[PDB]
Design a protein around this ligand. Structure first.
Ligand SMILES: Nc1ncnc2c1ncn2[C@@H]1O[C@H](COP(=O)(O)OP(=O)(O)OP(=O)(O)O)[C@@H](O)[C@H]1O
Ligand SMILES: Nc1ncnc2c1ncn2[C@@H]1O[C@H](COP(=O)(O)OP(=O)(O)OP(=O)(O)O)[C@@H](O)[C@H]1O
Ligand SMILES: Nc1ncnc2c1ncn2[C@@H]1O[C@H](COP(=O)(O)OP(=O)(O)OP(=O)(O)O)[C@@H](O)[C@H]1O
Ligand SMILES: Nc1ncnc2c1ncn2[C@@H]1O[C@H](COP(=O)(O)OP(=O)(O)O)[C@@H](O)[C@H]1O
Lengths: 316, 104, 254, 345, 297, 318, 257
């Protein structure tokens, strides 16, 4: 048994996080200076939020991490009776730390916490600021109520760009001696959708299945409506060619892809397609309306054909 | 820290041009209003005005939160003690000032 | 480093049961002279005064004075793990993040070691003065608890009036009113004999919830002491065998 | 006890000034047994609540007018106020928000369980008058139909709404549809004249017709404007300056501002006016209706069809969405684009 | 007592196929008075016998708990007891999915005979997991005969054409014509039932109003459209009823196929907008504007 | 008796069809001890649960299966993650070594908070417990959860491989099936074995025999002939006569405008319309289906379908 | 028609109380040799094996192998009606539609007859082996129950470490830390309060205290409890009925952090 590459190459220092440079440098500044304030960590999944918070806490606390840090996940109980009984009791606890160190409470995935739990969190954070600090983490920052963001230095994480994912993929490939081709790298990056965890998982899955990393193997392992088929269908919609676009769509339907998957890939490809920007925005709005219909439950081949027709008539 | 180091020690450490701390001591002496309340922007010393007025006029202070369990029943006794008993101390320090926080 | 041995740890269990409901959180003044505890709530309504002289312990050592922030609920939950006959030993340090308290069965092949986490809490307390109390009623603790419970079935406040004949307890409320008169014996039969000494009569009104909290020290001693005056808060005192004393002070209602 | 709009509300079905045929049918319905569940609907000011009170008056006793306030709480807790009597409960469960299901269930449960206390001398049920049923949610309406069919034998429901479009078909099936049309112009003139006579006044027919037309066949508006123009000038004149609400005037001036200039500056000014209308708590659909009604007065015949179709389209999108200003503002922008192109060409 | 249950009594072949099981889940759909519940209860009495009874059915949590307490229970000893769940048509999509889950994990020892008004079933119970059986409604003549018999034994004074109109405004089912007859004889005191009282009970718009709407649309002036739609709204007539009657008129007269097509597209989208909660007045004004544009060609 | 879906539910791994790539990959993972967390997704009734159950049964014997494979369904009840799943994943085995297995059927039905909690649980105990998530929509699984597992897409079952299993069913059971009946059964199945077997149940039970007319009448699906007639009336007959014909056919056969519209959409691409006519028809039919989904009157929506075709009549002819 | 007589009726009540919390419904594999029960936990972590030998019953007869499933909560509720001194008789007809429970007063004229509706369970059997454990601890059941209850205040998991001198139960949690050292009893004339340990190797394992608290519900059945545990095997908590049979609990150890 070997650790998965998502955990095998998990960063253990803030220096080896390829995420947002400004926030990473800010976290390193907090680790060096010492007097870190309460911080909120929002961003897309798989960008390094939890890794950054745990690395920061580890660097700050050293050996005192085991008894000075309280890490709570989505799998833990974090109700109103925890922010008031567990969080408060840990905050009141006496830990001897160096001069600029504090007890770090990591409410990881705090967006899952209710409004009442965070209201209980509010001045439990405020009072014990002399002795303990709170490091939140979430995907959506609007899920954290106003006072917590008011009393926290809201750090923002953003999707890893294509180049960052490519550099980390090169590092992992070199350290694992994995055969590859540039087309396979582009396929892995496309299927990653800006998540380093997803990129690593896809690369490891393709290595496990087929060893070699090329686009064919990547899309065999990471099965989704092929970006080339979806791209040429979008191109047919730009040329107002309903028949060819429906040929592609019906081929995708016969392959068994759900309309949700098809429309997701349609949006992904159309987002970075070669169009006049006004026409691209028109296509995005039409795809959004069709996706709203699909999510509402009206998910049939006729809906996708109607989307294709509306895209075709957007160009007249 | 720095902020609590320079908390208002006496009535003379309050800042001028302030209509809050200059107009509540009129009502707080012993014209028949019962309860108090807060409004306006935060950070204006609404938490420290009561404490420093109690310090200057010779009154004591109490504080409460939603950080502890505010069940409806315990919400009674957490305030009754603050309200209807005197002080087990010298007769000078008997008066008390009460605060309820984070109701919204 | 501080270390203290207690043969009768049931005393400590009873003390913590008496304290954990009146005060949830406390500071535990450890000194070479013994062990002291004094806490007043933020409401400043009631003060408890727990004293444990070092001469009452089996063994005692306190190199330097140290104050421990103790969660009384946590300490009570830990002391639940000790039997009434377990020899209880305390142990700490000056920089102690944790308090080491050891429960030993009387050579009954069972030894319990507990490391209790301490608070970051170091509030200083003032020394309550000593007043010539108008009336000092020494009555059985069980009788005091029974009276407090009965009158708490009636109203939230108790009116207590003391005279040379005896002390009178009464309560009133939206349900009704009730009276209990407790006059004194002629030194008859001794922990069950009510004894009163009084300078001038005094009447005071006290909340019954705090008296009910105070009565939880009933297992500590078979007798209780009530001392009161015109404007001096009632002091309820329990003698901890020969260990020390646990005094409750309660201010009168307006 | 003084307002003309309330001083002359008829007490019984036999003294209704219009829809007398329906009043006779309603007295026939209450005269027989097994009084059903009623779904009274019609435009505001048609008399639905008046007819419901009269129905209760021949159903229960005169003590139905002895109305007393009540308050109750619900378990979700949300406190809701009600109006009840010795025989009926009147509640608007809509004001409880999305917790209208639990409040409607609790109210009908409690009234049905409480009617059993030897309260059968006059009727064998308690009427639970629901007001603004159309404002309920779908889940609330399903709970309502379930409770209706479950306690039919002990409590009766009367539903009052302005339009049965938002009432689910299952509720319409279990109830008896009592359509109360808005009074005609002639009926409004007649009731206004009768009110003036009983007030010791004299009302010219021209002023009565003007009030009836300005009220848009809303009778409470007709009575309110009649009394207002009376206190403005005791001897009525056929060309009297009849007043009207300032939100209607503001809507008309907003439409005039939309017409007078078609520019983004005027768009932002109209958006400010739309805030003024919205925050004063008038419904967005009322804003759209009045805006279209005044905009059509300032449109050529070749433009009115497109303007009306845009108004309907954007009110529909407003119903779908959550921010009324977005769709009101988009309608105003589309109308100015159309009007600017038309007047330009 | 309502005349519905007072008189509640073709599809015995489904009872035969149910007895020939020595069994799938069932889906009985049709107009409400078509005896689906009676059919399943008769099949129950025939398949188990009088001494063995079944389960007949708040949300979905209590439904799942009841079905669990009922199906996870040893039988007398035939192998498969059933659960009914009448009025399934009103179940929400989440409730229907939870019910589909409840049908599984219990399919080893229990069956479900869902009773519904047709297309409301989500794709999971409707397709697979159920055996559909449609209950056709009684034909018009038989329905008129039954209404005549009800009117006779209830001394209701209604004419034969009144009965025909009652069936017309409640086309496709009893238990709606019967309720309308009961409400009409209650409103009129039984003395006389005319066309107007049935029209008002059924919520139907008078044909004079529809003719006036078409006349205003043909007139070509938007002021007449505004007046007629304002009057129709003031009278309290439901916009959905106006859409139905307008569609019935348009689809059958001698308008051009293009005019019919445009008016029917408009009617369909107006019906969708009204289903979404759009304003009746604005929808009707827009619909009449389209109709006027088509007629004033 | 017991339904054939349960009766003919596969037990051995060789019963599964058309998933030889997925089966071979999963079995290779089993053999080489590299079994990852699995996410099986696809249309209903394509054998994902049977596949994972067969793999688990070859992994663990019958007596060890009940203590090493925890099977739960997300539709049954966040408390699942923190209770049974967390307890099972955090503890070791009873009477075996190696990893335990959690089969979470209908994983798409979890809330996003529950899926985050499940992600944390899967991350913590990945060495001792492997999770198999079974869902219909991969899009319902949050990207954080589906980045912990290898995804296998169970596609629809092709007729050329679906037919033999139904042939085994009709050989073992005393069913008389025709060639057109088998073709119609496959077509109405559309890649769903559970649907195919349930249709076979209903048809062979109510009518006794399985044939195109019988299966179509039992399922209520419109015939190809009926859809052709509807299209012919819409494209040729005038609006009133087309409306009358379609209404009579629909009320006679109990057809749903949903199914009529679904089949007419297919015929629109079958028959050779001009491009603009096809765009107009597709837009109008998608609008009609969306308006159907909300609870409108089917009379008016049917008239709108007839209208959509009557508009294109003259445009096509010219 | 299976019928079993039991003069000491308190044993069945104690067994059902020991089973009602860990197991929700169980299949009573009642045969001629006696009554046998096996059931996984709902979370598939703990396993319980109940054995009641027919020789332990006062009058036992089972014509064939009966595998009826019962609701342990319902059975416990019904048995709550039986006094500790009542004689309990279980009866099942040739078709196990219902299990009949008859409670008879010890010396009075009161007779209680109860019937409980059963349920169908598709439960498979488990291959628990006979194994000798690297460490076996025999201690009073009350002491084990008290230790589990005490350590449930400290933390949710307990570490059981065994040595020649004694067995050590260590728990750590939010309010601090705690370990109970239980040295082997030296010499007591009564083994009822004796802590006897026979190991072949030191063993350290971690067990969830929720399941141990569930297990300790059987303490009224047996005064002494035997804890058998070796490296990488479940903890086996064994309670001996009065020669009638046994109650054995199998708990999977936690994964070490
Ligand atoms: N900037 C990065 N550089 C390298 N690897 C990264 C980076 N960001 C994410 N990863 C990969 O993703 C894994 C987890 O990322 P992250 O810190 O977001 O944890 P998480 O628990 O999955 O977060 P969350 O559930 O809050 O979205 C890391 O172990 C690593 O493999
Ligand atoms: N009039 C004043 N004179 C002196 N110091 C003041 C005065 N008003 C406020 N301060 C100081 O300003 C600082 C911030 O005030 P504080 O945090 O108490 O705000 P607040 O208005 O009470 O808060 P909120 O409205 O959010 O409850 C404190 O250090 C307080 O002593
Ligand atoms: N390859 C196959 N061979 C035989 N039967 C199959 C196959 N695939 C599916 N089935 C049938 O499907 C039915 C149950 O489907 P199953 O649960 O195995 O698949 P699924 O795609 O995971 O389903 P769902 O996701 O809807 O629960 C049984 O009747 C089984 O016989
Ligand atoms: N016959 C009548 N005579 C005078 N006023 C009437 C008559 N019928 C109805 N009204 C008026 O109708 C108004 C009530 O109608 P409606 O809007 O349906 O209910 P609400 O009482 O809730 O406003 C009352 O102001 C009343 O004056």
């Amino acid at each position: 048994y070997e650790l998965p590459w998502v955990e095998k190459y998990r960063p253990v220092k803030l220096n080896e996080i390829v995420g947002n440079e400004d926030t990473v440098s800010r976290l390193e500044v907090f680790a060096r200076e010492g007097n870190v304030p309460n911080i909120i960590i929002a961003g897309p999944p798989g960008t390094g939020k939890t890794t950054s918070i745990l690395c920061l806490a580890r660097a700050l606390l050293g050996p005192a991490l085991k008894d000075a840090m309280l890490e709570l996940n989505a799998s833990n109980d974090r109700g109103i009776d925890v922010v008031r009984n567990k969080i408060k009791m840990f905050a009141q606890q006496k830990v001897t730390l160096p001069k600029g160190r504090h007890k770090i409470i990591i409410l990881d995935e705090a967006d899952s916490m209710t409004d009442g739990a965070q209201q209980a969190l509010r001045r439990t954070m405020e009072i014990y600021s002399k002795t303990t600090r709170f490091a939140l983490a979430c995907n959506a920052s609007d899920k954290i109520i106003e006072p917590i963001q008011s009393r926290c230095a809201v750090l923002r994480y953003t999707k890893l760009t294509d180049a960052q994912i490519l550099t980390r993929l090169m590092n992992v490939i070199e350290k694992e001696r994995v055969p590859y081709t540039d087309d396979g790298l582009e396929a892995i990056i496309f299927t990653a959708q800006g998540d380093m965890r997803q990129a690593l998982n896809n690369l490891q899955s393709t290595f496990s299945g087929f060893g070699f990393i090329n686009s064919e193997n990547v899309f065999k392992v990471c099965d989704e409506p092929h970006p080339l088929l979806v791209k040429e269908m979008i191109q047919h919609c730009v040329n107002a060619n309903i028949d060819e676009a429906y040929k592609i769509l019906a081929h995708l339907w016969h392959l068994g892809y759900s309309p949700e998957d098809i429309i997701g890939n349609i949006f992904r490809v159309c987002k970075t397609f070669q169009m006049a920007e006004y026409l691209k925005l028109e296509f995005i709005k039409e795809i959004g309306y069709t996706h709203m219909k699909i999510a509402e439950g009206v998910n049939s081949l006729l809906q996708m054909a109607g989307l294709l027709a509306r895209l075709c008539q957007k160009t007249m | 820290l720095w902020v609590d180091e320079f908390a208002p020690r006496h009535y003379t450490e309050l800042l001028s041009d302030d209509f809050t701390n200059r107009c509540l001591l009129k009502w707080l002496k012993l014209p028949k209003q019962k309860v108090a309340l807060l409004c306006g922007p935060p950070g204006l010393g609404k938490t420290t005005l009561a404490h420093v007025i109690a310090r200057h006029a010779g009154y004591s202070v109490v504080e409460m939160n939603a950080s502890d369990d505010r069940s409806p029943e315990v919400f009674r006794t957490r305030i009754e003690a603050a309200t209807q008993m005197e002080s087990v101390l010298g007769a000078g320090g008997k008066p008390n000032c009460l605060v309820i926080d984070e109701i919204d | 480093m501080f270390e203290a041995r207690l043969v009768q740890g049931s005393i400590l269990k009873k003390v913590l049961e008496a304290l954990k409901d009146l005060i949830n959180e406390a500071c535990w003044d450890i000194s070479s002279s013994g062990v002291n505890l004094q806490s007043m709530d933020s409401s400043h309504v009631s003060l408890v005064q727990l004293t444990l002289r070092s001469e009452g312990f089996d063994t005692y050592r306190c190199d330097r004075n140290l104050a421990m922030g103790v969660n009384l609920t946590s300490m009570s939950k830990i002391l639940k793990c000790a039997g009434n006959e377990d020899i209880i030993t305390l142990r700490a340090e000056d920089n102690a993040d944790t308090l080491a308290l050891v429960f030993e069965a009387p050579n009954q092949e069972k030894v319990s070691d507990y490391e209790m986490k301490l608070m970051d809490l170091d509030v200083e307390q003032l020394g309550i003065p000593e007043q010539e109390y108008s009336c000092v009623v020494k009555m059985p603790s069980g009788e005091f608890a029974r009276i407090c419970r009965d009158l708490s079935h009636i109203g939230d406040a108790v009116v207590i009036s003391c005279a040379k004949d005896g002390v009178k307890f009464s309560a009133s409320g939206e349900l009704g009113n009730g009276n209990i008169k407790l006059s004194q014996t002629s030194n008859v039969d001794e922990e069950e004999a009510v004894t009163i000494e009084m300078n001038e009569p005094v009447q005071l009104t006290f909340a019954l919830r705090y008296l009910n909290f105070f009565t939880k020290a009933t297992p500590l001693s078979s007798t209780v002491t009530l001392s009161m005056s015109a404007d001096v808060p009632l002091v309820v005192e329990y003698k901890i065998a020969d260990m020390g004393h646990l005094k409750y002070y309660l201010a009168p209602k307006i | 006890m003084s307002l003309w709009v309330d001083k002359y509300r008829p007490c019984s079905l036999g003294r209704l000034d219009y829809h007398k045929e329906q009043a006779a049918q309603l007295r026939n319905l209450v005269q027989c047994g097994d009084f059903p569940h009623l779904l009274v609907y019609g435009p505001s000011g048609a008399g639905k609540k008046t007819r419901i009170m009269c129905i209760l008056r021949e159903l229960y006793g005169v003590g139905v007018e002895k109305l007393r306030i009540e308050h109750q709480t619900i378990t979700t807790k949300i406190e809701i106020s009600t109006i009840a009597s010795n025989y009926h409960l009147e509640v608007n469960p809509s004001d409880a928000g999305n917790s209208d299901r639990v409040v409607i269930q609790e109210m009908l449960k409690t009234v049905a369980q409480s009617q059993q206390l030897e309260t059968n001398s006059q009727r064998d049920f308690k009427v639970v008058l629901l007001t603004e049923v159309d404002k309920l949610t779908k889940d609330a309406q399903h709970a309502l139909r379930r409770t209706m069919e479950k306690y039919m034998s002990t409590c009766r429901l009367i539903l009052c709404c302005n339009s049965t479009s938002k009432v689910i078909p299952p509720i319409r099936s279990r109830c008896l549809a009592v359509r109360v049309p808005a009074p005609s112009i002639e009926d409004i003139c007649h009731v206004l004249s009768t009110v003036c006579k009983k007030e010791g006044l004299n009302l010219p027919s021209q002023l009565a017709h003007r009030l009836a037309e300005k009220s848009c066949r809303n009778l409470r508006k007709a009575l309110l404007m009649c009394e207002a123009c009376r206190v403005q000038q005791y001897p009525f004149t056929a060309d009297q300056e009849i007043p009207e609400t300032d939100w209607e005037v503001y809507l008309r001036e907003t439409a005039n501002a939309i017409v007078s200039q078609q520019t983004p500056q005027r768009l932002l000014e109209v958006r400010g006016r739309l805030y003024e209308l919205l925050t004063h708590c008038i419904p967005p659909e009322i804003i759209m209706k009045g805006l279209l009604s005044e905009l059509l007065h300032n449109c050529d015949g070749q433009l009115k069809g497109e303007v009306a179709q845009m108004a309907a389209y954007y009110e529909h999108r407003l119903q779908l969405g959550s921010k009324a200003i977005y769709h009101l503002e988009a309608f105003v922008a589309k109308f100015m684009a159309l009007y600017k192109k038309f007047m330009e060409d | 007592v309502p005349w519905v249950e007072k008189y509640r009594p073709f599809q015995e072949e489904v009872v035969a196929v149910l007895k020939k099981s020595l069994l799938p889940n069932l889906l009985f759909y049709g107009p409400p008075g078509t005896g689906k519940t009676s059919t399943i209860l008769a099949a129950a009495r025939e398949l188990f016998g009088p001494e063995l009874f079944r389960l007949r059915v708040r949300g979905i949590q209590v439904v799942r708990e009841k079905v669990k307490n009922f199906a996870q229970l040893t039988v007398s000893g035939p192998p498969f007891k059933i659960v009914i769940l009448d009025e399934a048509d009103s179940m929400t999509s989440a409730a229907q999915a939870a019910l589909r889950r409840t049908m599984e994990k219990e399919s080893k020892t229990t069956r479900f005979c869902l009773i519904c008004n047709y297309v409301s079933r989500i794709i999971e119970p409707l397709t697979s997991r159920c055996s559909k059986f449609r209950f056709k409604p009684l034909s018009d003549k038989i329905q008129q005969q039954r209404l005549l018999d009800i009117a006779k034994k209830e001394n209701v004074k209604i004419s034969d054409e009144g009965i025909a109109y009652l069936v017309k405004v409640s086309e496709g089912d009893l238990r709606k014509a019967i309720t309308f007859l009961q409400s009409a004889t209650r409103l009129t005191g039984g003395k006389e039932i005319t066309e107007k009282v049935i029209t008002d009970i059924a919520g139907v718009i008078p044909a004079e109003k529809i003719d006036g709407v078409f006349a205003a649309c043909q007139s070509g002036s938007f002021d007449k459209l505004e007046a007629v739609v304002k009057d129709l709204i003031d009278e309290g007539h439901a916009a959905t009823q106006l859409v139905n009657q307008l569609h019935d008129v348009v689809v059958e007269n001698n308008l051009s196929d293009k005019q019919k097509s445009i008016i029917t597209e408009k009617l369909a989208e107006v019906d969708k907008c009204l289903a979404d909660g759009a304003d009746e007045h604005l929808q009707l004004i827009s619909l009449c504007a389209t109709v006027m544009q088509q007629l004033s060609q | 008796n017991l339904p054939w879906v349960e009766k003919y539910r596969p037990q051995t791994l060789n019963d599964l069809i058309s998933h030889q790539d997925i089966l071979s990959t999963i079995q290779k993972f089993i053999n080489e001890d590299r079994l990852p967390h699995l996410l099986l997704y696809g249309p209903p009734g394509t054998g994902k649960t049977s596949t994972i159950l067969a793999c688990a049964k070859q992994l663990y014997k019958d007596k060890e299966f009940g203590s090493m494979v925890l099977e739960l369904n997300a539709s049954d009840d966040i408390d699942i993650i923190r209770g049974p799943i967390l307890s099972f994943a955090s503890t070791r085995t009873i009477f075996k070594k190696g990893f335990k297995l959690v089969i979470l059927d209908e994983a798409d039905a979890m809330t996003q908070d529950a899926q985050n909690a499940l992600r944390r649980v899967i991350e913590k105990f990945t060495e001792n417990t492997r999770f198999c998530l079974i869902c219909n929509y991969l899009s319902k699984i949050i990207p954080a959860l589906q980045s912990r597992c290898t995804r296998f897409r169970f596609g629809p079952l092709t007729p050329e491989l679906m037919v033999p299993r139904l042939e085994h069913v009709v050989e073992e059971e005393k069913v008389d099936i025709s060639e057109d009946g088998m073709k119609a059964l496959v077509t109405l199945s559309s890649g769903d074995m559970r649907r195919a077997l349930n249709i076979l149940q209903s048809t062979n039970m109510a009518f006794g025999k399985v044939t195109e007319e019988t299966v179509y009448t039992c399922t209520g699906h419109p015939l190809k002939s009926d859809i052709a007639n509807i299209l012919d009336w819409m494209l040729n007959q005038d609006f009133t006569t087309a409306y009358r014909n379609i209404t009579e056919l629909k009320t006679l056969k109990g057809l749903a405008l949903h199914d009529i519209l679904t089949e007419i959409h297919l015929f629109v691409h079958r028959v050779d319309f001009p491009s603009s006519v096809r765009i107009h028809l597709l837009t109008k039919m998608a609008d009609i289906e969306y308006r159907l989904s909300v609870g409108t009157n089917e009379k008016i929506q049917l008239s709108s379908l007839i209208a959509a075709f009557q508009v294109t009549r003259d445009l096509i002819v010219a």
